[PDB]
Ligand SMILES: CC(C)c1cc(Cl)cc(C(C)C)c1NC(=O)NS(=O)(=O)c1cc(C(C)(C)O)co1
């Protein structure tokens with residue numbers, strides 16, 4: 001408790017903001033994945049040592065992990081349960097760099113010489129918050145071994161995290177892993193009696209709460225939330241807190257002008273393009289090269305030399321303003337969905353690489369699933385679909401549009417080489433491309449239709465596709 005006080009003081013300062021935390025709006029969380037309360041996550045139904053939080057990209061995994069850190073450090077959360085909470089941001093943990101569990105803990109500390117032998121003294125009093133398992137750069141398979149049992153042994157990041165997840169390293173330490181549903185396949189086979197919880201995002205009421213927290217003027221917030229209520233697609237899409245942030249930020253620029261507020265967006269691509277147009281040109285190519293470079297070479301954090309290579313001298317005021325975020329020399333995109341957006345846009349620009357190579361590594365953990373790169377370029381390729389359309393190549397959009405139909409034809413009726421794309425994921429892809437002549441031709445490749453509906457967003461996307469396969 002001599003060091004515990006010093007440590008909690010650091011946690012109260014580091015997790016003070018989202019990157020204040022007075023914008024935090026309660027998230028819907030469901031056990032047996034039944035709404036759970038955070039204090040009761042580790043309380044048994046024998047003791048609960050591992051808790052997995054599944055959650056779609058932009059649902060708030062990282063925000064809830066930081067709110068957990070801040071609340072614990074304030075003395076509200078797990079007051080009597082944990083002496084130490086270590087936040088492990090997976091985006092930064094090298095799977096190849098040899099490190100010990102000791103160095104991993106020492107990196108979560110303010111001072112250069114922490115009492116690691118004192119911290120490790122009571123392992124049941126430690127809770128490790130592994131944030132964003134899906135964000136681990138490179139491959140991560142079950143075959144990784146031999147498993148480590150020495151917290152001071154330097155092993156590569158994959159053996160280190162595999163041993164910590166399988167509860168071989170500090171077996172009675174508590175673990176909280178947050179992941180995108182896609183990556184759950186890799187993780188499921190390491191997990192020892194996990195308690196699964198599903199992050200469901202905002203309710204219709206807490207969607208309204210977000211809008212009123214964001215627009216500090218009630219009169220602005222009410223008029224900004226009215227646009228979301230009038231639009232079924234935006235209302236539905238807004239259970240995702242990132243979508244709420246994106247919509248709100250765009251409606252702020254539009255708010256400055258005397259032009260009546262209106263967002264006619266019907267697809268995720270159109271939402272992202274509405275956001276990109278609010279913050280608007282010459283630096284739009286360099287952003288795409290940097291994003292698609294990171295997608296293929298597993299780079300989520302971009303050093304000053306990477307931006308130098310991609311001609312971002314420019315990123316000082318323009319890109320850092322709302323498209324980039326400085327961290328800890330080290331800059332990353334506002335979100336990985338935004339990285340996957342520029343990665344897809346890169347393919348559709350008049351001067352782009354081969355689209356067929358991307359589809360070869362779709363659903364592969366190593367490449368990064370590529371869910372939003374594919375899903376975005378289905379909507380971007382859309383001939384019906386901005387100021388950005390002039391920059392997009394009218395010609396190469398048709399070349400990709402034909403390759404996408406050949407791919408959807410293969411995935412629709414083939415022995416699964418990977419779990420992804422699931423039939424629902426293909427429906428999300430098809431929802432982005434709204435062209436009925438494309439969507440009808442694509443729906444003919446489906447032998448059986450699989451309803452696996454979880455959210456009212458899944459109902460929206462799937463009902464759209466099902467309607468497009470009547471076949472007279
Ligand atoms: C709620 C999901 C479907 C969502 C909807 C929108 Cl409109 C926008 C986004 C991003 C662009 C902000 C996301 N988020 C993810 O799609 N996340 S995910 O992890 O890829 C994923 C894949 C899946 C299924 C489909 C079941 O396979 C679930 O979660």
Ligand SMILES: Nc1ncnc2c1ncn2[C@@H]1O[C@H](COP(=O)(O)OP(=O)(O)O)[C@@H](O)[C@H]1O
Nearest residue numbers: 023024025057058059060061062063241242245
């Ligand atoms: N509970 C929340 N309250 C307010 N904003 C939130 C909340 N959860 C997420 N957000 C918004 O979502 C954005 C990114 O969310 P994040 O936690 O990184 O999701 P994930 O890590 O699952 O991809 C934040 O910039 C923020 O504006």
